[PDB]
Design a binder for this molecule. Structure first.
Ligand SMILES: *c1ncc([N+](=O)[O-])s1
Ligand SMILES: *c1ncc([N+](=O)[O-])s1
Ligand SMILES: *c1ncc([N+](=O)[O-])s1
Ligand SMILES: *c1ncc([N+](=O)[O-])s1
Ligand SMILES: *c1ncc([N+](=O)[O-])s1
Ligand SMILES: *c1ncc([N+](=O)[O-])s1
Ligand SMILES: *c1ncc([N+](=O)[O-])s1
Ligand SMILES: *c1ncc([N+](=O)[O-])s1
Ligand SMILES: [Cl-]
Ligand SMILES: [Cl-]
Ligand code: NA
Lengths: 298, 300
């Protein structure tokens, strides 16, 4: 029993974190096989012109107390790829993946190549994440683990004025309408991830929190007019299908739960709480709820 | 920027988790050097879970009654002993992945990371606090017994908790790694209940200081309070007493923000009276009490 915001065990990623230094800039890199990936910003004082000017030896890569020799360098979008003379013996089985808004992942925050903390995040609909990063955390990575495969999905690049964070996938493509520069950038207005709120209400029920349930049901059309009103993302038929397992387990159909959510949007929580929260939590996916309640291991 | 409930990286602990089986019962063990630590109730039988005599159950065991599996490798038990509520199994192989470590018993209010494990394999990692009533609010399903809690300040792993059981209100109880329970609980299936829980006042104040460091000042006021008047009010909201030790502990955060500790106490007094009026603090609509003063400095 109990239900908690839970990160993946981070050991498989910890063995891949290194320190990358170019000039007076230091940040984190990801060492997989014989390549180190890090943000291309590490060469900043025109990325095309800045890189051609560079040479292998301008890069100092440190894995713990061992320097790695760089023998090649290339750029892929916003990510720098440093070829080193040694394959990481701790490389896990892994792949690079790009996630969608509303999906969740664990972040391993690192400083000077040293892992410091791990926490679970969601890619927001405005393509930011609500992380915790200080100066020097650039290059920290986000990931999921399935079975024994690490799926890397995020590399941290920068902090936006609102205190939220922006980054890229591991092929250097930004999530959201952001660029890797010191310039005026702002997160768009954010919205709430409706299917995740429903998943968390299902988790609440499985844990014995039932006061918000009622006898009523709604329609997708009717509810989505309410969702738009409260800056909730639209609920789609695919979302309903994904919640199917939780509906069967608890006996509350999705549109039955939507009537509960509608009521909580329109009337508040009347001073009560759900899973110890006074806000509606939207950083648990339906998969997250089933996995935690199943005891899946890696 | 940002503020998150942040766990420690779990890899140093993942490399120590094993599966321990006795009879039909399997749970998690902690493999450090040539010793595997696990809850002693693994030697219980289904007819004798209310009043087990562990001394009598253990003397009847041979080393080969204990099956210890590290991943795909079976470890050979060569000795066994009991220390309070923890069983210690000597194995013929020292764990090559043993980190630098120590055992520490913590006090209520302290936080630590939990690596939830099933059948010796890690499931996830999350932060917890020792509540004033000596329980933790975790996520533990059947088979999670033996999972451990830990901190990793610097590069030494401080093991502080081993999970033993679930109480009727859905909260959890366990021991330190010397096998002494936190709180008045025992490893028997007799009726046990947690005492009424209270809020960890010093942690709430630390979290308000973090909010100020993060840039939020809307909850401050022009008032101050004496320590005794604060405690008289806070006790009426089921808050733990604030001691002079707690005031001293908050000194560094007070210095960093320029807000005297008793001035922040006056702010908390007003929050308890008014609520947040639709606003949030560090993303929360409730007052958070599972960040310690040390945690706030670590993360800020
Ligand atoms: C780093 N950010 C912007 C650059 N430029 O091309 O001028 S280098
Ligand atoms: C992620 N897990 C296994 C992979 N493989 O194909 O080797 S990728
Ligand atoms: C830290 N990593 C990348 C940055 N950028 O400005 O793109 S800052
Ligand atoms: C997910 N599965 C079971 C739970 N419980 O609270 O017992 S949460
Ligand atoms: C501690 N809380 C918030 C911080 N920030 O850097 O925004 S530090
Ligand atoms: C943490 N506990 C013991 C250490 N040692 O150096 O032996 S480090
Ligand atoms: C975890 N293993 C055994 C338990 N019990 O209470 O019987 S809890
Ligand atoms: C012996 N088996 C289970 C116990 N328990 O109290 O959880 S004692
Ligand atoms: Cl109806
Ligand atoms: Cl909340
Ligand atoms: Na309903």
């Amino acid at each position: 029993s109990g239900f908690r915001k839970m990160a993946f065990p981070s050991g498989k990623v910890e063995g891949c974190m290194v320190q990358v230094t170019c000039g007076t800039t230091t940040l984190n890199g990801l060492w997989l096989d014989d390549v180190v990936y890090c943000p291309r910003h590490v060469i900043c004082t025109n990325y095309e012109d800045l890189l051609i000017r560079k040479s292998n030896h301008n890069f100092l890569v440190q894995a713990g107390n061992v320097q790695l020799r760089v023998i090649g360098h290339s750029m892929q979008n916003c990510v720098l790829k440093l070829k080193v003379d040694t394959a990481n013996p701790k490389t896990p089985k892994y792949k690079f993946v790009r996630i969608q808004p509303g999906q969740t992942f664990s972040v391993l925050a690192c400083y000077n190549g040293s892992p410091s903390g791990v926490y679970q995040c969601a890619m927001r609909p405005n393509f930011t994440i609500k992380g915790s990063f200080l100066n020097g955390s650039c290059g920290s990575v986000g990931f999921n683990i399935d079975y024994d495969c690490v799926s890397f999905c995020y590399m941290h690049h920068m902090e936006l004025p609102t205190g939220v964070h922006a980054g890229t996938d591991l092929e250097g493509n930004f999530y959201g309408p952001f660029v890797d520069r010191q310039t005026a950038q702002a997160a768009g207005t954010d919205t709430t991830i409706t299917v995740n709120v429903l998943a968390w209400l299902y988790a609440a029920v499985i844990n014995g929190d039932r006061w918000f349930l009622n006898r009523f049901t709604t329609t997708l059309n009717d509810f989505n007019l309410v969702a738009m009103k409260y800056n909730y993302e639209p609920l789609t038929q695919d979302h309903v299908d994904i919640l199917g397992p939780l509906s069967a387990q608890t006996g509350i159909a999705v549109l039955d739960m939507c009537a509960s959510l509608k009521e909580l949007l329109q009337n508040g929580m009347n001073g009560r709480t759900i899973l110890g929260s006074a806000l509606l939590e939207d950083e648990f996916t339906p998969f997250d709820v089933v996995r935690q309640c199943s005891g899946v291991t890696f």
